[PDB]
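Q: Hi! First time asking for a complex rather than a single chain. Here are the components, and I think there are two in total. Is that enough to go on?
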Amino acid sequence: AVLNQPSSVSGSLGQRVSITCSGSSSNVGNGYVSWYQLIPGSAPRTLIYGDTSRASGVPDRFSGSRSGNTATLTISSLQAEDEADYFCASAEDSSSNAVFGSGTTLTVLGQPKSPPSVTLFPPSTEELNGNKATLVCLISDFYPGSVTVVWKADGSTITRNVETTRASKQSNSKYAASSYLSLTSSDWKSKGSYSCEVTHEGSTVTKTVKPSECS
Amino acid sequence: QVQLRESGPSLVKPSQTLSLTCTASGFSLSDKAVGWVRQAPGKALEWLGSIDTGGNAGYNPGLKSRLSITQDNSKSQVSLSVSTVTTEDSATYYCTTVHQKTTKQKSCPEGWSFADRCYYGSGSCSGYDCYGDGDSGGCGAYSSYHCYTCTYCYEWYVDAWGQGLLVTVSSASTTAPKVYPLSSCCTLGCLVSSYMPEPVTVTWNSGALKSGVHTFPAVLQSSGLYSLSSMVTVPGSTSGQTFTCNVAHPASSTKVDKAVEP
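A: Yes, that's all I need. Here is the structure of the assembled complex.
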């Protein structure tokens, strides 16, 4: 399947950050974990292999370790260039089969923390007349630039036909994201409430629309 | 430094076969294998498979049914094939060089009844080589360095990564977007829905409003079509001004305006 990593991790300049990577005995338990750094617009960069070995050109700040079925990447002193996505990986009970982690977005703090402003838009009358219904959840003014979105229909999580953009920097240097839930005009009228739940730094902001009252 | 370049079509119709080629150069490519790793937008990296110098191929078990990887030694090219592609196969495909080595090392497996008297740790890749297989037979009443199991240690990591090649799977032709207003039930925006093949240019009030406007990146939806939104933040609590977004699609040669109001 996939190795579990925290979605986001943040720290100040010169501080120490750790990123966990938990799996099972057939992957991380094998004891040969690697770490990779992904910067947008650039090719992926290998940082660590074999739990603790550093690839060529990798600074001494990056280090790796493992305990049982859980591996950890550590950055002792953080710098501006360290901001990126970080993935762990390991072989899956064979040398030719490997699995990756879910990935962690690392932010070097450069401005105060800001919670997300969330607005859930109902489908327009014009779209409903075409027998369609798209819910648009627009998220803005949050920092660090990383959120997770959960769509709910009458208190039940739904994941079908859901698309979410990754955080994009605004003009004021804060970040924004968008999420879409595509429905038919019948699915829209068949539920009593829809909700968009945005989780940011362990805090959740929720907006809810009701197809009956919203008109 | 080993150079990797991905070649192939950017757009592939569903139910067809996705074919890609990687051009590998450099002396160090002989030692390590060449593999393929893909990542869908906003998703984790996914391992596809690899092929070594001798021509042996290994694949992701969950995808081996749809995967074929071959290599051309003379052109120093490695090819990938994904059969019967769906919209889920839209991803960025990386050509890579991969280190693969199976070794036998001393370890102390968990379910083993003599693991509590064994010094080499539970991890298979302990770093201490052994020969043979299984229980060493030297475990007694007390702990000893002769008490161990000779297990398989699977070493794997990607050495070098290519830049990647974004591939989109959709049967749609060039389609003009449909613009819908974004107004709260009780910030406003415009939804640019179901268009192909990017991009679309969004302005507000024919360019008279640009500050306080944030247009998002597009998403690729399960329909095979793109959708984005443009957002307007009104300052100063000034009320009673009409807002109109202008959407232009080059492929369809279309220009549409939609007024937004409560």
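A: The longest strand of chain B covers residues 91-107. Let me know if you'd like any chain examined more closely.
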